[PDB]
Amino acid sequence: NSIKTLSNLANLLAQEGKAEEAIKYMRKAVSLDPNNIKTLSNLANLLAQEGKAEEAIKYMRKAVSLDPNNIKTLSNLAVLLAQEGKAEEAIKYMRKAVSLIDKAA
Amino acid sequence: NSIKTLSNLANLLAQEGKAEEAIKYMRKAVSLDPNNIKTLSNLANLLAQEGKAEEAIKYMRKAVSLDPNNIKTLSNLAVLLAQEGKAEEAIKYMRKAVSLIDKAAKG
């Protein structure tokens, strides 16, 4: 609803290279529903796109905690951790994703 | 106009449910610089969100081929493949990514 609208505006501003405003609207969107995985991941990726990897990782951990079996979230978190030089933890989450993929098949 | 303009126009068009036009403009953006990894990933994401998973996979594969050590590209591709039910190849890309992370960590 309003979350989707805020998300659209945010992503438009970001795709136009105006990331700070995008982050403002995104934080609003997350505030409206703090348990939405999609919006949390969106916020995270916007923060990471700005070089702020730590806060991004925070929100990604939140999203993972919301659903530990989603391989997209696990993979994304793993990527963020790897970019920050946390090899062991990244490899851990990636391998968890591998296990889930192999299990579902 | 530029790649940025065409790409964002494509994004808003997609948001308006004008997927055909969106893909048109995003492909126009690609044509200006066919080996641009960023644009390729953008088109891939667009195709994926519209349901066109297979095409998206093809463009993600080209992206990987342009830079095979990018773990973001490898991971995104793997997630897509797994989504389409291609478990083994997805796992292969993820283990590639893991090997790269370990290799980079070892210095």
Author numbering:
A (entry chain B): 1 to 105
B (entry chain A): 1 to 107
What do the authors report?
Here we show that such hairpins are detectable and that one of them, from the ribosomal protein RPS20, can be customized to yield a TPR fold by repetition, with only a small number of point mutations that are neutral for the parent organism. We concatenated three copies of RPS20-hhta as an initial construct, connected by the TPR consensus loop sequence (DPNN).
Indeed, an M4NΔC construct, which terminates with the B3 helix, showed the same stability and dimerization as M4N. We obtained two structures for M4NΔC from different crystal forms at 2.0 Å and 1.7 Å resolution, respectively, the first (CF I) with two dimers in the ASU and the second (CF II) with a single chain in the ASU, for which we constructed the dimer by crystallographic symmetry. (a) Two dimers in the ASU of M4NΔC CF I. (b) Dimer constructed by applying the crystallographic symmetry to the single chain in the ASU of M4NΔC CF II.
